[PDB]
């Protein structure tokens, strides 16, 4: 056939580029960083109404100060999360401190290109890693299967991403409040989702310095959806 | 590098089948027919030899029926050499179990083990699967008399009567017609031979062509006896049942 680590004539790894196509098929995930916190939101996308939607875990805790949202082949993320959690806890054991969000992300991204003929293929999942540390404050990173990560003020990944990113382009400013960022994630998710957005097929979360990483209750998100509907009807 | 020459023996087809397993089963469909029939008071194993020559030394020959321990025997359909590899592994597993627990291995446990080995060759290692289907005839004190079959996929199932190898479709229809649950060993012997006599590709069924065995709980004082039939004894049972 052909090597798994083969370069194309344009200078790209075939398998890495093909995994990026798998991530485009995944459900939407959006992250917005502010000075009051970082918000992470996802489309759950249950394949059937009998599937108990609260078991869809596409937003995940790495440590108290670091959260993570995923998009793509979400089964591939489990070992990445495991490595992230272990890296975070291990660094606290060795250094009696929280681990920097960038350093955590860099550790996750070091797994990415460990594939060949090590694992047999790249990961088929992109991660939004959101967190806070004392040095660089509230941060949002986009961790790809290429091994590259970019910091972002805001970022969308998954099937509605280019549409959502253009919307995040206009809407994001450096003075956003946390409440504003929550509504903005819900707004853009509702825009790019096939099904109608509610508290059962979409999930919010955030990370603040005081309270750390929290996945929102369905009752809490339901109120923010109702608040969104009213403010859009207001003009 | 080497990738160029790799057949990739452990992959799914677009339809979700294992190519090599399917092709191995095709191989096995040409092998000599083996029949197992389970009765209330015993099990029969009958099997048809493939290579009729007058110069084959039949009394010292064994291509179909093998002994795994005192309670369990197998009938083989496919590559004999492949079967012997598996047979020796099974013989060891039985003696490991006997050494560990000081009890003879239950039939199903032995069958599962062999079947798991076969399965492994379909899921990893890049090697071809074993081109073998077994009929296991055995006894233990839990389930009594048992018949199983395993095939190159590593799937195994239990049976009252079953065939493997050539003409199994025809053979299974005939067994399904004449088998009954209250049947006895002597009746099952007759059924096994009659089924082979009709499904055989040969002109006539003779003693020099058959391997035959019974597992009876009709030994002295409630023990279990494995009888691998000698050529003369196969000739006698052919005259008794009225085939020759």
């Amino acid at each position: 056939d052909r090597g798994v680590s083969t370069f194309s004539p344009e200078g790209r790894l075939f398998q890495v580029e093909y995994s990026l196509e798998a991530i485009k098929l995944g459900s939407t995930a959006i992250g917005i960083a502010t000075k009051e916190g970082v918000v992470l939101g996802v489309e759950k996308r249950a394949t059937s109404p009998l599937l108990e939607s609260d078991s869809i875990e596409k937003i995940v805790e790495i440590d108290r100060h670091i959260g993570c949202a995923m998009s793509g082949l979400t089964a591939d993320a489990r070992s990445m999360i495991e490595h992230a959690r272990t890296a975070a806890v291990t660094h606290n054991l060795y250094y009696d401190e929280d681990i920097n969000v960038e350093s955590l992300t860099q550790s996750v991204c070091d797994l990415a290109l460990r594939f060949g003929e090590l694992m047999s293929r790249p990961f088929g999942v992109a991660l939004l890693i959101a967190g806070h540390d004392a040095d660089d404050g509230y941060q949002l990173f986009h961790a790809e299967p290429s091994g590259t990560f970019y910091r972002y003020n805001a970022k969308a990944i998954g099937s509605g991403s280019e549409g959502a990113q253009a919307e995040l382009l206009n809407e994001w400013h450096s003075s956003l409040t946390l409440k504003e960022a929550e509504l903005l994630v819900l707004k853009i998710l509702k825009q790019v989702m096939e099904e109608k957005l509610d508290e059962n097929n979409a999930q919010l979360s955030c990370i603040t310095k005081q309270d750390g990483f929290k996945i929102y209750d369905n009752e809490k998100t339901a109120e923010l959806i109702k608040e969104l509907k009213e403010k859009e009807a207001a003009e | 590098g080497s990738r160029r020459y790799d057949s990739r023996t452990t992959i799914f087809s677009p339809e979700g089948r294992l190519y090599q397993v399917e092709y191995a089963l095709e191989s096995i469909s040409h092998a000599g027919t083996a029949i197992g029939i389970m009765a209330s008071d015993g099990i029969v194993l009958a099997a048809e030899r493939k290579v009729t020559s007058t110069l084959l030394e039949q009394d010292t020959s064994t291509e179909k029926l093998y002994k795994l321990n005192d309670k369990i025997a197998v009938a083989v359909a496919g590559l004999t050499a492949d079967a012997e590899i598996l047979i020796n592994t099974a013989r060891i597993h039985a003696q490991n179990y006997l050494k560990t627990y000081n009890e003879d291995i239950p039939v199903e446990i032995l069958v599962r083990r062999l079947s798991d080995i076969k399965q492994g060759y379909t899921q990893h290692g890049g090697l071809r699967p074993f081109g073998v289907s077994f009929i296991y005839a055995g006894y233990d004190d839990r389930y009594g008399y048992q018949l199983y079959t395993s095939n190159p996929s590593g799937n195994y199932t239990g049976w009252k009567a079953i065939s493997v190898g050539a003409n199994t479709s025809a053979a299974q229809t005939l067994l399904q017609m004449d088998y009954k649950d209250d049947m006895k060993v002597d009746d099952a012997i007759e059924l096994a031979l009659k089924t082979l006599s009709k499904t055989t590709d040969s002109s006539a069924l003779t003693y020099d062509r058959l391997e035959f065995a019974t597992i009876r709980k009709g030994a002295n004082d409630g023990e279990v006896y494995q009888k691998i039939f000698k050529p003369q004894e196969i000739k006698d049972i052919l005259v008794k049942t009225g085939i020759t």
């Binding site: 052909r2 090597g3 680590s5 083969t6 370069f7 194309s8 004539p9 344009e10 200078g11 790209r12 790894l13 991204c109 990415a112 290109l113 060949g116 003929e117 986009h142 290429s146 091994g147 590259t148 970019y150 910091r151 972002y152 003020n153 805001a154 970022k155 990113q165 995040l168 382009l169 994001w172 | 590098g1 080497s2």
Partner: protein, 231 residues
């Protein structure tokens, strides 16, 4: 064509296509410039962003107090190679109490890259590196290609549109080599050199990345408002 499926295969004209395709990843990468005098050595890098919300990808990596590089191509491969350089610089210090010679650093990178081009299963590195350093024989600048070819130079550039900066340096050779004991003027010449490779975009405050090493100057990277002086 038929001879590009893996790195182990020569073509009928004696070419290694997988290595040449890795070389192509460098040309797609963002421009970076290297140049030196007798006293100092400078790296200037044009960093690339994904979009207006994203950060600009870091191009310069520190290897030791007296050595570092800039990258163009696959950033994860630069991380692997720079980490290897950090270890070799570190091994030289711990075992021999000796700062690793820049020339010897190049030789190590060449030999690491080579092993990936002759063995099956592996792939070539998909990145080019410009190593600067100040050692016991003064300032040095190296260019690393993932074929294995390493080259000691007065100045150079790699990445997209790098030919423009490379021509400028080829003219300026006699001027910038003489910029001794003046770090700001040497950086100016590097910033003026990288400007020849720009089209449409210009050098902004979070776009530009500069690094310098010299006689009494540890390898230090300048980003953000630290480079506003040179815009």
């Amino acid at each position: 064509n038929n001879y590009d499926g893996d790195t182990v295969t020569f073509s009928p004209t004696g070419r290694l296509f997988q290595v040449e395709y890795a070389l192509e990843a460098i040309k797609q990468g963002s421009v970076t410039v290297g140049l030196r005098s007798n006293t100092h050595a400078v790296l200037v890098a044009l960093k690339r962003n994904a979009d207006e919300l994203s950060s600009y990808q870091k191009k310069i990596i520190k290897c030791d107090e007296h050595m570092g590089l800039s990258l163009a191509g696959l950033a994860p491969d630069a991380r692997v190679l720079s980490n290897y350089l950090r270890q070799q610089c570190n091994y030289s210090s711990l075992v021999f109490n000796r700062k690793l010679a820049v020339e010897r650093a190049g030789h190590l990178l060449c030999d690491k890259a080579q092993k990936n081009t002759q063995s099956y299963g592996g792939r070539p590195y998909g990145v080019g590196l410009l190593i600067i350093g100040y050692d016991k024989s003064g300032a040095h600048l190296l260019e690393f290609q993932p074929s294995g070819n390493v080259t000691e130079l007065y100045g150079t550039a790699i990445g997209a549109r790098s030919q423009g900066a490379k021509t400028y340096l080829e003219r300026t050779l006699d001027t910038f080599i003489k910029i001794d004991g003046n770090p700001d003027e040497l950086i100016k010449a590097g910033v003026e050199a990288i400007s020849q490779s720009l089209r449409d975009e210009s050098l902004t405050v979070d776009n530009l990345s500069i690094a310098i090493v010299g006689k009494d100057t540890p390898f230090t990277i300048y980003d953000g408002e630290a480079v506003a002086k040179y815009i």
